[PDB]
Structures are given as structure tokens and as C-alpha cells.
Design a protein around this ligand. Structure first.
Ligand SMILES: *[C@H](O)[C@H](C[C@@H]1CCNC1=O)NC(=O)[C@H](CC(C)C)NC(=O)OCc1ccccc1
Ligand SMILES: *[C@H](O)[C@H](C[C@@H]1CCNC1=O)NC(=O)[C@H](CC(C)C)NC(=O)OCc1ccccc1
Lengths: 303, 301
């Protein structure tokens, strides 16, 4: 198929990762300009994680409660000169600006969108992978104890858009974190209690992109002349655990390159949801929603 | 499952990528110490990729025929002061040693084993992904025009083991390349003609690891008391498009943590191959061979 889970090269972000230690708890931080970001439950005692009072924990801290260390590249112990709490994140101001700060922005990812993750333990990057923000605001990641503060991002040009800081593993095997405005994705809360999670959905726009990728690879058995309008598909999706389809220029590019209209694939999805009739698509017998229209454009067509 | 396709952080390898131009052909090179490695077909004009005489092309090159440029980090134009051909690769000697040269070795990767790929264009890293070397010595990569010289590697502690330099896409969707001794993986030639692709097979050790990943996540409906010896399974495997199983300490670790014997999962594979009978394993109805015993051990400790 030529489609793989492709992450951004992680070098620019590796040079920003630090270890943050507060008392007995230790995890990862992101060092940008004079600021280090990390999850606020690094303040919390390991025997108080269900019902922490983060406001009281904050009050009890000083600048000297925080130990910030960079082990990668040029090592350094960074002097914390200020501390603040924003939602589920701390902002630690340090006396040294990171000389390796890339051009960056902060942004929020939406369901169906993909981003790269740099998994870190004790301030050391250990691996990278890409995930899709699920419609229930979890990601299907690979995170163990000590991974919090691991960072997710996309890149536009030379600009890194940080969009995720890892916080938590849910009862199923999935994961969630905060955007860098400090709000948790999907109104989970960063406390060690059992929380209900929304039910997931198929990302319709991503299924469509994937079927275009099959067509680009010559696999078009599911294509028929029949069509389903976007309006009627979206009414259909609400009754069948799919997100509503919202067209983008990226999808339009796939339609023009293949001669297959979006509505034909929308009709195809309604049929394929009932069953693949034995046959498979790109080696799969189920619908796949982990590739975006941008991924198909980049990887198959170099756009 | 806690299972994703995870590649190594790429920073160390990003600092070693360069762009190598010869004539009107451009692609990527790997700059280690004073050597720049790149695919020899940089010397070949595009109209002649079908049957290149690399002996003659190399003869007609001079040091000045090659331009090597570093775009990432501190940009630099390196003087080529020697050029040599080793199998399907060129080894260019440049006047200055890469000051970012990591600790490294060269190895060859075996079928079933996973490695990370740094995909590059014009010497600029653009993506990273992980692959398993298939039994027919292809990889299911994502490569376009201009990606040759992209590099595959594993990392042991602080040592990078370079094992793959990208060369070509085959008629099906797959890709192959060279080891750093210059030999192509699996009987291919760096000539643009259609060539015989051998048949792929399932990587049984990887199916075994995946079944252990399932057990670890409480999905053990397929486990029975029945056993198939490694010997009997391997005779069966040659008949059914499976690699022969060879145990390792990594698989043994999974057998011990779960208490389920390798020979139980081999019996399971034989039944599962005929069909899952509407059942599911970690969200699939076909066997999965893309995750190694090592992946399962590390990601699901
Ligand atoms: C935060 O560093 C970290 C993330 C977890 C660790 C296990 N896998 C992860 O992704 N650990 C936490 O314990 C997190 C912090 C709460 C105060 C929000 N809590 C959590 O993930 O609870 C679920 C859980 C913990 C340990 C194992 C399995 C699930
Ligand atoms: C080197 O840049 C290139 C990588 C190919 C380009 C398309 N996708 C790839 O992975 N390798 C070649 O172009 C290779 C050169 C031979 C002398 C080894 N030829 C090749 O791969 O032909 C197949 C092909 C070419 C162009 C598009 C699709 C398939």
C-alpha cells in the first residue's frame, strides 16, 4: 500500500526534553525559551494521587522544590526562578533560555488528526510514534510508568506545533493528556480515580482517505456508481457510531486525482460497514481510520 | 494493546544525513567520520537506469563530479577528496570528519527483525517509521522519488547499528536496499528492470510474540492444552507460508511471564491460520507478524 505510520524526525524536540523532579516524584518536562512545562501531578505525593488538592500543593512549593535536569546533549541543572500552574500543567521559569529552542507554536489537535509523540523516561527520549486523536479524546499510545511529560507535536514548516503532554492511562489500554493551555483532552481529570470514557467512533474523513489510498493502489472493487450525499451520510453516521464527514481540500485532491467522487466513497462506507463480503481492502477486512487525507497525499502522491 | 510501531529517536542519525549530487541526479548520503555513503546509481543518467555499466560510470567520475552538502544543523559544503565503489554503494571520502559522528557499527538485519528508517529527500530528514525485514528481503516502506540513500538502523544502548540504505521500489508495493557492505538484500540488483520477487511469508516468531501480547492483555481464548513441538511446527510451516520458528531468550521471557508454553502458541497458530471462526484477537481477524518479541517485552514490560 505504501502507507506507514510515519512520525516527524524527532531531533528538534529531543534537544528540549528535561527531567523534572519534585520531592519523590519524577517525570519529563519540555524546555522552551525560559520556560519548562511538565504535568502538575509531579507535585503530588504518590500516596495522595486519587484526591490531590493541586492548589494547596502549589502553595506549599517554592522555586527550590523543583529540580530540572537535562541529560541529553549538553547536560545542565537548570535554576528554577519562578513557578506557576495553568490547568493541569506547571510552568517553571528557568534562568537560562534553551539555546536549542526551535521555532514553535502551541495548538490543539482535533479528533481524526494525527500527531507525532516522543516518549521519554527520566528526561531521556526513548522512542517515537504517531497516533490519531480519537473522537473520544484518547490516543492509542504506548506509555509506561514514568512517561508523563512526554510530548506530542506536528510540524508545519520549520515550526513545531506542540499539541499534547502525556498525563494518564485509562482503564482500557488508551491514553490521554493535556494541551499546552493546560486543559485535558476530553474533560478527563488528572486524578487517580476511575473515570468514565466516552465511546469511540470511526473517523469518517480518515476512512474516506484510506479508501482513496486503496484506489490509488488499484484496489477499487468497493467502488460503484451509487452515491450518498454528505448530508444523508452524516445523518447516517450519527445512528451508526461514525463521526460526521467534513470535506477538506486534501480530500478534494484525492477525488480529482482518482476520478472517484466523495459521495461514491460515502455510499461505499455504508455498504462496507455491513461487512466486507469476504474480500479485503489494502490487506484489511475492517475499515481503517488511522490515516488522514494529508497522510495519503504526502505518502502516496508526494503532495 | 499497548502496542505501537515505535522507532528510535532520530536526532543522532539526522545529524549524519547529507545530500549527494552527481550530474543531474540527486539523493541522500550518510556522513560518518570522513566517509559519505550513498547509492551508486547517483552516477547513472535517468535514461540509462535500465542496464547501467557502473564500472564504466565510476571510471569516468572524478572527485569533482560529486557535490556533497549538509543542510541540517550547521550547514556546510564538503570537498570530496576520494571516491570508491563497494558493491551497490559509493564511499566518498570528504576532507572533514563529521563532528556529530555517533558511536556506530554496520550490521545486516534478518527476516522478522524490526529496524527504524529515517526517510530523507535532498538530504533533509522528513519522516521516520519502523519496519520488519520481510522473509523475501523487502520492506513495506513509504518511499518516493528522491528518497534513495535514506538509512535504516537499530540502536543498542548508545551505539547505532546501521543496517539499510534505500535503493528501490518493486512492482508490488514494497522496497529494498543495501547493507553497508554494499550487498543488496535478498537477490535484487540495482538495475531498473522488472525482477523476480520471491514469495513473502509470515514471521512465526513475530506471530508468537503477538499472541503473547494478547495473553498479557487478558485475551487468551485461543490457548489450549495442546502442544506442537518446534520440529513439527517447522515442518508444517514450510507447507503453509510461514517461516520456521527459532526460539530466543526474548520469547522465553514472554513464555515465563505468562506461563504459557511456546509449544501451546504454535498449536494455536496452526488452528488460527485456517480461520478465526468469527473470533477476534486484539482487534484483528488475521494473524499479525509486524511486532517482535523485543517490542512486546519493551512496550508491555
Ligand atoms: C504519569 O506519569 C503516568 C502515566 C501512566 C503510567 C502508566 N502508563 C501511563 O500512561 N502515571 C499515572 O499514574 C497517572 C497520574 C494520575 C494522577 C493522573 N495515573 C494513571 O495513569 O492511572 C492509571 C494507571 C496508572 C498506572 C498503571 C496503569 C494505569
Ligand atoms: C531512489 O531515489 C529511488 C527510490 C524509489 C523511487 C520510487 N520509490 C522508491 O523507493 N530508486 C529508484 O528509483 C530505483 C533505481 C534503480 C537503479 C535501483 N528504481 C526504482 O525503484 O524503480 C521503481 C520505481 C521507480 C519510480 C517510481 C516507482 C517505482
Amino acid at each position: 500500500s505504501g502507507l506507514v505510520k510515519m512520525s516527524h524526525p524527532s531531533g528538534d524536540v529531543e534537544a528540549c526534553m528535561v527531567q523534572v523532579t519534585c520531592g519523590s516524584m519524577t517525570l519529563n518536562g519540555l524546555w522552551l525559551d525560559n520556560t519548562v512545562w511538565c504535568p502538575r501531578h509531579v507535585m503530588c505525593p504518590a500516596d495522595q494521587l486519587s484526591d490531590p488538592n493541586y492548589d494547596a500543593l502549589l502553595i506549599s512549593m517554592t522555586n527550590h522544590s523543583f529540580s530540572v535536569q537535562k541529560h541529553i546533549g549538553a547536560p545542565a541543572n537548570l535554576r528554577v526562578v519562578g513557578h506557576a500552574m495553568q490547568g493541569t500543567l506547571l510552568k517553571l521559569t528557568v534562568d537560562v533560555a534553551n539555546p536549542s529552542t526551535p521555532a514553535y507554536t502551541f495548538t490543539t489537535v482535533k479528533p481524526g488528526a494525527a500527531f507525532s509523540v516522543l516518549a521519554c523516561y527520566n528526561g531521556r527520549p526513548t522512542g517515537t510514534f504517531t497516533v490519531v486523536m480519537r473522537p473520544n479524546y484518547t490516543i492509542k499510545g504506548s506509555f509506561l510508568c514514568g512517561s508523563c511529560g512526554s510530548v506530542g507535536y506536528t510540524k508545519e514548516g520549520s515550526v513545531i506545533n506542540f499539541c499534547y503532554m502525556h498525563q494518564m492511562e485509562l482503564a482500557n489500554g488508551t491514553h490521554t493528556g493535556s494541551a499546552f493551555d493546560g486543559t485535558m483532552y476530553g474533560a478527563f481529570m488528572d486524578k487517580q480515580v476511575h473515570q468514565v470514557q466516552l465511546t469511540d467512533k470511526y473517523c469518517s474523513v480518515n476512512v474516506v482517505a484510506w479508501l482513496y489510498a486503496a484506489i490509488l493502489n488499484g484496489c477499487a472493487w468497493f467502488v460503484k456508481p451509487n452515491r450518498t450525499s454528505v448530508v444523508s451520510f452524516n445523518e447516517w453516521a450519527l445512528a451508526n457510531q461514525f463521526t460526521e464527514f467534513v470535506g477538506t481540500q486534501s480530500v478534494d485532491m484525492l477525488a480529482v486525482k482518482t476520478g472517484v467522487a466523495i459521495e461514491q466513497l460515502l455510499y461505499a462506507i455504508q455498504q462496507l460497514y455491513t461487512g466486507f463480503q469476504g474480500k479485503q481492502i489494502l490487506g484489511s477486512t475492517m475499515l481503517e481510520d488511522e490515516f488522514t487525507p494529508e497522510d495519503v497525499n504526502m505518502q502516496i502522491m508526494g503532495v
